[PDB]
Design a protein around this ligand. Structure first.
Ligand code: ADP
Lengths: 420, 229
């Protein structure tokens, strides 16, 4: 419940890039549409109008003294990889070699194309095809609502569907089903343990269960006490930050998207503790201006800054929950007017909203704050907007002690490509 | 006030309904306590820009305006009026709203308001700026709110400090400096969309690049336009 004015952290924006053309209609359904390579500096913009690969350094343009920071750079050079069907999700194995696009065709149902990343960088391959598909064997039901790649096991990914079911995949030179739980489990969302050793699945009854990769049930986190009867929430999204530390978004089960979602931190006890589950509540941080999309919370931890970014489908603001110097507790940060990460107003005067969210660490370019003063390169938060626009902001952090999170990228060698 | 040999250009929202050029404040028929305020400040004759601005702004009903003049012309004075002349002190809640581009001009425009409103009794200002003190649950009882747009938008939206469907006037100052500040342009446009149709929209700017112009047009509907050379 606490809050804190933060003067020493500022999202300082780069120029906004137009990727896709403003869609006629509002991208209502749940979606994640940016992946990033931090290993080889790349970014993966999907949509219902192709797939787009950029060298990350091509998407980031500092504003000079004079520019309108709201003027867009229309187009910027990348790769277009044409796509019969429209991509409702993008994703990337941990070694950085397998883009995992998720489409919905009217004659297959939902399916998942796995590209080898070498292929995109491989000139002699003009048609950039995938090497493996995965026919999930369902139509609308099969909409990939949440899908995540193991953080340390590149071959292993965890896909999770509109209809409540979930499956764990192995992807090598082909695709193996390792495990699949049927709809009647009512899985709503998904997340690996930090070490990739277990998988945590939030469900509709309101609980988050923990599974071995073979879907054996290990621990059940109960539904927080304060949501009493009559107002039944459901996990919406779940971030396993530490062995006994969880961010867990809730929301109504009657789909009345009119109610705003609550973020909750959940510090769990341990085997030598018969302590109840400490659920600290930081209610509707990303303020919901919208109630027309089905909710997302993109969430992602920055371990070395011990803070969590959080954006919502239905809000135009990135919020920041930081761990206190107290080492247990949390706090919402409150940033200066001109130091926020918010999606612009469409030129038709409506709110652009998030389609994907990523952080790039590969950046080397040093921030040219003024004529005379230049600051070291910062990580760059990026946003896909429902207007087809990408919104890079450096994340300047100056809290004492925090260290430089910048990591130089590599040159993908073609060696070992998988052919279709 | 800086001297101005060049003349003002006035694009009236209603071409066939001319009304311009007041060469005195007494002509305006201002609340007695306001006109006193004016005297108090050593104001003698209206300024070049006010001559044309104030009629429109102080029309019955009031008109919207986009105004372009350089520093020391009397922009601020002119809108300070705009607001004070709509503000009912006895009603303890914000009715007038002023977005400033810096913190250090929200305070400077404050002093001008407070000085001018001197003889309105119980007139109180709210400052929606970085590092105000206001806890949640609270609501503002000050009839005017000066500030910078985010903090202001916070006040209407998130924090529920202000109910914008009670604002009668809305100024945007330094619309050029504003667009060139991160967040501001979008922030202001979002404040504006929750103001009520009747609310008066007044917009002011030193320069006037297309960007600024284009911006004005999203924010100030049915506007009279004024440019001074
Ligand atoms: N009608 C007036 N008569 C004399 N001085 C004025 C008048 N109006 C404004 N001033 C003074 O001239 C200066 C510039 O006016 P101001 O109200 O700040 O408009 P601007 O925003 O164009 O500077 C101010 O210091 C103000 O006190």
């Amino acid at each position: 419940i606490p809050e804190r004015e933060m003067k020493d952290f500022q999202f300082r924006a780069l120029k906004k890039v137009r990727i896709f053309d403003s869609p006629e209609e509002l991208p209502k359904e749940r979606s994640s549409l940016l992946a990033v390579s931090n290993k080889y500096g790349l970014v993966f913009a999907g949509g219902a109008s192709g797939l787009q690969i950029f060298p990350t350094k091509n998407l980031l343009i500092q504003n000079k003294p004079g520019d309108d920071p709201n003027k867009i750079v229309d187009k910027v050079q990348g790769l277009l990889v044409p796509m019969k069907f429209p991509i409702h999700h993008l994703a990337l194995s941990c070694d950085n070699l397998t883009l995992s696009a998720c489409m919905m065709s009217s004659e297959y149902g939902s399916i998942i194309a796995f590209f080898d990343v070498r292929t995109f960088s491989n000139e002699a391959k003009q048609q950039k095809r995938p090497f493996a598909y995965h026919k999930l064997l369902k139509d609308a039901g099969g909409m990939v609502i949440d899908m995540k790649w193991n953080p340390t096991v590149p071959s292993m990914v965890a896909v999770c569907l509109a209809d409540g079911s979930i499956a764990v995949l192995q992807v090598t030179e082909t695709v193996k089903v390792c495990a699949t739980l049927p709809s009647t489990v009512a899985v709503t969302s998904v997340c690996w343990s930090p070490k990739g050793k277990q998988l945590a699945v939030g469900k509709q009854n309101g609980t988050v269960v923990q599974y071995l990769p073979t879907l054996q049930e290990k621990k059940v986190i109960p539904c927080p006490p304060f949501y009493e009867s009559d107002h039944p929430v459901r996990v919406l999204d779940v971030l396993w930050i530490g062995t006994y530390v969880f961010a867990i978004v809730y929301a109504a089960a009657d789909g009345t998207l009119e109610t705003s979602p609550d973020v909750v931190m959940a510090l769990l006890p341990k085997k030598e503790e018969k302590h109840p589950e400490i659920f600290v509540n930081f209610m509707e941080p990303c303020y919901g201006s919208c109630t027309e999309r089905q909710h997302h919370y993109y969430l992602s931890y920055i371990e070395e800054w011990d803070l969590v970014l959080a954006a919502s489908a239905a809000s135009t603001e990135v919020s920041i929950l930081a761990r206190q110097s107290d080492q247990i507790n949390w706090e919402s940060w409150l940033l200066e007017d001109s130091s926020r990460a918010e999606l612009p107003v469409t030129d038709k005067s409506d709110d652009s909203l998030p389609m994907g969210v990523v952080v790039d660490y590969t950046n080397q370019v040093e921030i040219t704050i003024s004529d005379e003063k230049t600051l070291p390169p910062a990580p760059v938060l990026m946003l896909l907007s429902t207007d087809g626009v990408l919104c890079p902001f450096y994340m300047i952090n100056q809290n004492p002690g925090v260290k430089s999170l910048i990591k130089t990228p590599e040159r993908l060698s073609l060696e070992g490509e998988r052919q279709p | 006030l800086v001297d101005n040999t060049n003349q003002v250009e006035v694009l009236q929202r209603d071409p066939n309904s001319p009304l311009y050029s007041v060469k005195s404040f007494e002509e305006l028929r201002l609340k007695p306590q306001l006109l006193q305020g004016v005297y108090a400040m050593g104001f003698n004759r209206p300024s070049k820009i006010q001559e044309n601005a104030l009629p429109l702004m102080l029309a019955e009903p009031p008109q919207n305006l986009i105004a372009q003049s350089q520093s020391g012309t009397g922009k601020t004075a002119a809108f300070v009026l705009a607001m004070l002349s709509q503000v009912e002190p006895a009603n303890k809640y914000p009715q007038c709203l002023c977005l400033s581009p810096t913190y250090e001009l929200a305070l400077q425009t404050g002093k001008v308001i407070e000085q001018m409103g001197k003889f309105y009794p119980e007139l109180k200002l709210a400052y929606a700026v970085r590092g105000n003190k206001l806890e949640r649950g609270q609501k503002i009882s000050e009839q005017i709110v000066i500030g910078t747009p985010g903090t202001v938008l916070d006040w209407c939206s998130k924090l529920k400090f202000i109910d914008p469907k009670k604002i009668k006037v809305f100024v945007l100052d330094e619309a050029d400096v504003m667009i060139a500040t991160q967040g501001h342009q979008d922030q202001s446009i979002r404040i504006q969309r929750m103001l009520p149709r009747n609310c008066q929209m007044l917009l002011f700017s030193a320069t006037f690049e297309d960007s600024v112009w284009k911006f004005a047009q999203k924010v100030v509907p049915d506007p009279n336009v004024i440019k001074l050379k």
